[PDB]
Write a protein that binds this ligand. Sequence first.
Ligand SMILES: Nc1ncnc2c1ncn2[C@@H]1O[C@H](COP(=O)(O)OP(=O)(O)NP(=O)(O)O)[C@@H](O)[C@H]1O
Ligand SMILES: Nc1ncnc2c1ncn2[C@@H]1O[C@H](COP(=O)(O)OP(=O)(O)NP(=O)(O)O)[C@@H](O)[C@H]1O
Ligand SMILES: [Mg+2]
Ligand SMILES: [Mg+2]
Lengths: 312, 312
Amino acid sequence: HHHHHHMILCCGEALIDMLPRETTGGETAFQPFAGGSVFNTAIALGRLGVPTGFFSGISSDFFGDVLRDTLARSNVDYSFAAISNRPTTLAFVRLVDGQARYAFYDENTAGRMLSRNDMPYVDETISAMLFGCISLISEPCGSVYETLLAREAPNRVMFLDPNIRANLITVRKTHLTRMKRMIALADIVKLSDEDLDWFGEKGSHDEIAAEWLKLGPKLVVITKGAHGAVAYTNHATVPVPGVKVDVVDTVGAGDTVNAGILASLHSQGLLTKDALANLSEDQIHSAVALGVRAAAVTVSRAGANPPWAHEM
Amino acid sequence: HHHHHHMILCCGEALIDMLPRETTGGETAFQPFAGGSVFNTAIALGRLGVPTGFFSGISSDFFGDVLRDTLARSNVDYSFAAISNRPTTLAFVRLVDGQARYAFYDENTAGRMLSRNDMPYVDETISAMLFGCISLISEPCGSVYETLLAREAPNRVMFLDPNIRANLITVRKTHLTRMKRMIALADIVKLSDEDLDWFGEKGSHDEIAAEWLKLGPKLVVITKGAHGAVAYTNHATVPVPGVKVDVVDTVGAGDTVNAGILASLHSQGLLTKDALANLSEDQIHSAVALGVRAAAVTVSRAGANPPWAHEM
Ligand SMILES: Nc1ncnc2c1ncn2[C@@H]1O[C@H](COP(=O)(O)OP(=O)(O)NP(=O)(O)O)[C@@H](O)[C@H]1O
Ligand SMILES: Nc1ncnc2c1ncn2[C@@H]1O[C@H](COP(=O)(O)OP(=O)(O)NP(=O)(O)O)[C@@H](O)[C@H]1O
Ligand SMILES: [Mg+2]
Ligand SMILES: [Mg+2]
């Protein structure tokens, strides 16, 4: 086993986004792009210069090759991932009558059919783990990821990004109970206002954050689009304004906020459970502001294309 | 139940071929094309003006819509098909170092997961049925198609197009025994020289055709690329020369030969088991020559794009 040098290990989906493009012959085709929210977060972390790892199910096929190539060039260690001959998850996007239509091809895929046997070896040189998004909806991988979070939560820092995609949730009740169990096990929870709306809880979003801070998390961050983010602890509330940019699109911007927060806490030497329980206003602001600043670069260009440290 | 007016019912795969194209931005994308060998044969039959039906598994999703739209515009009756919410089979093609690479995404698809419950209602107004190609390799659909052939063989004319795709055959022995059982139940068998090579039998291809004419078929046709085809019965051997054309590609050309043969036999009023056992040299030549002439149009343009009668 290799020393992972105080690594942040991202655990979750890697997929191919299949997006509509125009061919030379004036016909619609689908151009493949490496993607998946947790994948994007891992890419963003690597580009910020943090020691970064990725655990997922990845195919041996040519789409799997795309994913691995992208991870490698962003310096992400994906030795943790389970490789199999199952196909790669494909996410088709179309514009139909000025409205977005989605088709999710995830049958018996490398990513979906993870088993307990596939769980990574995690020693003291992993400082933190991140979970989130659609890898937690699907089965059997969702149960594997929840099990991994529950197994490792006592040992190191846990970050959860609910990142709700309701169109893929077939039974609300069952995903909601999983979210609550996983929030209870998280040290840091980051989500958008829209994410939070899906939980259907009472009161202002500030009030709900305060309630969640009684359930396990030491830090709750609510992202607010162009408006930045607000961070909540039991000792402080820290509003962080957005950065003004010329917007191309905002897809995957939240994935970069995850990276900025974790990268800053890493740099500050605050990635321990105990350190997180004692964050100062300055330490919180620094971490969420890096997430917000980094995410602003992403929204300034097409797709989830997170910033290199040297781009900032 | 509707009168199908002496219909030829094609039974087999419908899929999306995903082919490499250049985007305006100089990037590779995959353009979707309606396809599948048995689908192509049904399209070709419809375009030749023959009453034509199609039994398959087809998705309710947007790729399924492409398939249905294509069938409708070629006047094919697909009321027989089983519609489900399972995804559509995707066949990816790439050019890697001047060599063709294939990736077949067929997990839990509309086409693959057919059951006995899905088999069509077949009455006296169906004159013939056609089977073939990769729908016979996969399970469970392959068993369903073989069962349908065995059930209907005593009642009407059976056409088999082995159309071998060895890259998708995982166990040779099991597909070979299925081919032999289905050949035994066929009135007409058409295949290429390369198809025949895969059977690994002894002697000249003329000798092997003669052996198969002792096993059930009344007509065996071997296609020979630019060289046309040779047709074999117990009463005659009929060489049919190829038509010279400017070749674009030959993909799916064999599917049009199927259509031409069946369309001619339909027009001549020879689509009964008894009529096929008594074919004259002239009747054989007419049918195979239409297949060869029609296929020549297909090879004159990109992909499996079979000719309308009014194009000939
Ligand atoms: N219009 C904008 N202008 C500047 N920054 C933006 C804009 N929209 C989003 N951002 C940045 O991106 C962060 C996250 O965006 P936000 O819309 O809250 O996440 P999200 O809805 O979860 N996006 P996604 O990753 O696609 O799920 C914000 O906190 C900002 O820092
Ligand atoms: N180079 C050519 N020139 C003219 N006609 C051709 C040419 N190639 C094929 N054809 C026609 O297409 C028929 C079938 O082609 P052939 O190559 O024998 O089938 P195949 O190998 O089974 N093709 P496919 O449908 O892709 O499996 C031939 O009998 C010809 O009538
Ligand atoms: Mg948003
Ligand atoms: Mg050929």
